[PDB]
Design a protein around this ligand. Sequence first.
Ligand SMILES: Cc1cc2nc3c(=O)[nH]c(=O)nc-3n(C[C@H](O)[C@H](O)[C@H](O)COP(=O)(O)OP(=O)(O)OC[C@H]3O[C@@H](n4cnc5c(N)ncnc54)[C@H](O)[C@@H]3O)c2cc1C
Ligand SMILES: Cc1cc2nc3c(=O)[nH]c(=O)nc-3n(C[C@H](O)[C@H](O)[C@H](O)COP(=O)(O)OP(=O)(O)OC[C@H]3O[C@@H](n4cnc5c(N)ncnc54)[C@H](O)[C@@H]3O)c2cc1C
Ligand SMILES: NC(=O)c1ccc[n+]([C@@H]2O[C@H](COP(=O)([O-])OP(=O)(O)OC[C@H]3O[C@@H](n4cnc5c(N)ncnc54)[C@H](OP(=O)(O)O)[C@@H]3O)[C@@H](O)[C@H]2O)c1
Ligand SMILES: NC(=O)c1ccc[n+]([C@@H]2O[C@H](COP(=O)([O-])OP(=O)(O)OC[C@H]3O[C@@H](n4cnc5c(N)ncnc54)[C@H](OP(=O)(O)O)[C@@H]3O)[C@@H](O)[C@H]2O)c1
Lengths: 448, 449
Amino acid sequence: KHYDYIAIGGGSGGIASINRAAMYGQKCALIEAKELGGTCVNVGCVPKKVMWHAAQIREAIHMYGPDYGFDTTINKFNWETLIASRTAYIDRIHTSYENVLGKNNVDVIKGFARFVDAKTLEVNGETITADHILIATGGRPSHPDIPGVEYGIDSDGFFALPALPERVAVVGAGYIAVELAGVINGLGAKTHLFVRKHAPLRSFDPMISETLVEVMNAEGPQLHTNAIPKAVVKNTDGSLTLELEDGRSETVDCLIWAIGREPANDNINLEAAGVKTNEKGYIVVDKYQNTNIEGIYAVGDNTGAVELTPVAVAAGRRLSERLFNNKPDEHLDYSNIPTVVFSHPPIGTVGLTEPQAREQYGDDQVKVYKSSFTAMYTAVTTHRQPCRMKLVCVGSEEKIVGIHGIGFGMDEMLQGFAVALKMGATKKDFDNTVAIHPTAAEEFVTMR
Amino acid sequence: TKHYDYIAIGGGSGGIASINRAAMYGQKCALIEAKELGGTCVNVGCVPKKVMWHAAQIREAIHMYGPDYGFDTTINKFNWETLIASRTAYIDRIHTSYENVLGKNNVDVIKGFARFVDAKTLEVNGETITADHILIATGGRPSHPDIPGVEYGIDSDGFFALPALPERVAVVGAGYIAVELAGVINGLGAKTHLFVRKHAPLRSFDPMISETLVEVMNAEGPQLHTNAIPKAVVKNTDGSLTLELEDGRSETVDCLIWAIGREPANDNINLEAAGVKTNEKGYIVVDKYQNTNIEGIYAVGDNTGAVELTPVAVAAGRRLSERLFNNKPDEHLDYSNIPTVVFSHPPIGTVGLTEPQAREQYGDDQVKVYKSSFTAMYTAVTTHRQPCRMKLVCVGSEEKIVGIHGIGFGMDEMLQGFAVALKMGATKKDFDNTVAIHPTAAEEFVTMR
Ligand SMILES: Cc1cc2nc3c(=O)[nH]c(=O)nc-3n(C[C@H](O)[C@H](O)[C@H](O)COP(=O)(O)OP(=O)(O)OC[C@H]3O[C@@H](n4cnc5c(N)ncnc54)[C@H](O)[C@@H]3O)c2cc1C
Ligand SMILES: Cc1cc2nc3c(=O)[nH]c(=O)nc-3n(C[C@H](O)[C@H](O)[C@H](O)COP(=O)(O)OP(=O)(O)OC[C@H]3O[C@@H](n4cnc5c(N)ncnc54)[C@H](O)[C@@H]3O)c2cc1C
Ligand SMILES: NC(=O)c1ccc[n+]([C@@H]2O[C@H](COP(=O)([O-])OP(=O)(O)OC[C@H]3O[C@@H](n4cnc5c(N)ncnc54)[C@H](OP(=O)(O)O)[C@@H]3O)[C@@H](O)[C@H]2O)c1
Ligand SMILES: NC(=O)c1ccc[n+]([C@@H]2O[C@H](COP(=O)([O-])OP(=O)(O)OC[C@H]3O[C@@H](n4cnc5c(N)ncnc54)[C@H](OP(=O)(O)O)[C@@H]3O)[C@@H](O)[C@H]2O)c1
């Protein structure tokens, strides 16, 4: 069959790009092997946030609630009810996505696709061809090459757990490790986080990882630093012992690898299309998402860019705008992309860290504003939690180049401040907006 | 007679902020407060109100959402005395740090009701004190209806002194405080009733907000009674009160809260002697720079009839001390586009014009509205799903954003940044060019279609 545009992968980039293109008169087909929505709807963003919410509820009941007057008994935590509720929600999401593509006249082909040549793909026996092909195949979890690695599960295995384990070890030191560790500890399991060096999120502003370690030390997960995994030993009773290179070891009932992800560009026969990947397996793309072959583009996690659903969506829309809506210089700007980590407490960050700004502009040009305070929600309890916020400003005008914060509210408050950052806000612009009281967000417009 | 360079009457929000900024620049100051430092905000407003909103968030987490996330929970006892004790200890620690800052700033705090003897002289506790500049930041107080039985009702100060949570509560009113108190008492488990005189509460807010707020009320409390004009409150033999309404309906409850407005506390300080003019409602009349008609007397805050928010008092007070004492002759607060959050259920966030106001002011042909409605994710996996509804109001070819309105979980915290953007003159294009943050409720304003 012949289509004007085919996207391989019904994850964030594929779906976004094919719907914008179907809007401009194009005949499109989306191909997906597993479920619509990709990592984000199925084993990523949506199910992670439901599980963050379950943890926040258990913490209100068990940690904070007592000091607010509530003497409560959790009679039963039914893991089955929670997973049946998250699954029903995701099934409603699948049906919505189906309806949108249907409205758009996109032909959805369920099956695994592989290249025959630069303009042809084989899917379920059938051959389909198109003048433009988007590869948006995403990624998959990495696993250390050590003895016993197959005893651990990864973040996809986390979403399939039949019950909450008593003792869990999470290995890794980036976003996924920090969030899964935080959720699982929040839901009651004895939780350990093993990181290789001094702290998790070592690339984030120093304030953020220094504060996360503080919270961890007060309320869990138990953090272990300088921890290089050597081997996992399954024991007689069925538990696992993670052995570390320095001699330390820990026995758990479950071990989750959260050590990075890797592109899923391999069994699709790129060689036949002539598309080049780099040393790490990512499809190499330019500014405009073009591969080296004319007529083939890539967006998303499979290109090595920052792995976030909104980046994949925005690059994918702009791509269909360039191609099918005659906007030749249209493309995504990958700087000042806002991030929120759903840790305990949430992290919100956009723009440069203070080390980055002091390297790029020099100490003499950088002015930093910091605020540290107890989140009000916790201030009336014996489990008080810091909130810490930082503005990084450059030049006499104190143009704002990075906004960082960690504490309750960082999740919802960051977006509007990113718009502001994008417009070129200065300290004065923040300062001349009237605060909203009582909120945490108002601390960014009243820093002194 | 001691003479000061600056004296504030009122140690609430405008008074503490203006006096501290003045002391920073070398002025010898005195703050006069008749009751407790921090005023309405710290003691019977902002701070205890949010502590009580969090306690409602917690009971609703245990009782309403918890079950569908699999937590089978039993509240063995809800101890009101513990909650009130933690709330009070937090307000005492706040009194202590204000005294700490005023003390570092060498401000003389005098405790007592002050009254003007003439334009430059004040009497407080038998002593006469004089100053070159005087700030009147006296605030306001609850208004009460003029109907038989009014004294059986309490108001918002009384709500913060309740010795226990009543089983049946009536809240009468349709503003911020009635919507807040009524959703808190309802969230805390009491059979709650809201009585409004016309068709909906918050009738001055964008219609989408009052419309959605009624939807939620009908689905999960408080029980809302529209077209309700109070006629009388009967104290009954068994202790309960019966609110009777003009059209004949009545309701028996154990506690009734008047939340019908506030009025300025400008009347007992002998303004006549100083010569200060007030308006027909009793507010002190001020210009753009917080000046009264008497040279060297200024007022900020709720006693001026400007929008009654703690940050507006604080910002006008701080900027007034910049103008008088730090050489910025044109320093003044711009009262437009001031952001508000109502801590209702769900929160409301709003800034700029409503859709009716933008269509009146710019004409229908110039106004473009974007809307978005979804279920809040926290609730979408439960059998108690709540809407989130968001609106952007734009004008002209450029689609300059003149209003941002929303009601839904996350509106309390997400609004501050967007208000900085509106202030900067953002258009829809600028919102659309920022990369969303997923999964949040906030991202909806940058992906609106
Ligand atoms: C645990 C976890 C948490 C995350 N949380 C967040 C978060 O809260 N916020 C955030 O912004 N980001 C989050 N992310 C990242 C986010 O999920 C990704 O950045 C995003 O999904 C990338 O979109 P994509 O289109 O590149 O790939 P994906 O969504 O991974 O989609 C790729 C799709 O292609 C399909 N496919 C692959 N090859 C073929 C083929 N040859 N034929 C047919 N079908 C094929 C796959 O089945 C899959 O559905 C998270 C990731 C993980 C794993
Ligand atoms: C229930 C409730 C909830 C609220 N919630 C919020 C909210 O969340 N966010 C928000 O921004 N706003 C809120 N507000 C409004 C806010 O509290 C007021 O806008 C704010 O406190 C006004 O500050 P002010 O300095 O004008 O006066 P006030 O805080 O009222 O203080 C004036 C002070 O003057 C003192 N006084 C009066 N006359 C004299 C005298 N002659 N001599 C000496 N002392 C005197 C009084 O004792 C008082 O301490 C709320 C109000 C209420 C009642
Ligand atoms: N809410 C969100 O925005 C969100 C949430 C989750 C994921 N995502 C995205 O998905 C991307 C990939 O996720 P990820 O967190 O798995 O990868 P990641 O961010 O690259 O973090 C993995 C980290 O684990 C450590 N590590 C690597 N090998 C290790 C090993 N052998 N043993 C122990 N530790 C090892 C490294 O840190 P050290 O060098 O310090 O050891 C590495 O930086 C993220 O970068 C993010 O963009 C987004
Ligand atoms: N979010 C915040 O920052 C916050 C929170 C709380 C309070 N505050 C401030 O404090 C101020 C005062 O709040 P408020 O709620 O007390 O007053 P309000 O906002 O003026 O609202 C009271 C409403 O009560 C109704 N009403 C008046 N007389 C009535 C009567 N006799 N019987 C029944 N209903 C009657 C009127 O609405 P109808 O005409 O529709 O009946 C009136 O608009 C607010 O304006 C606000 O600025 C701020």
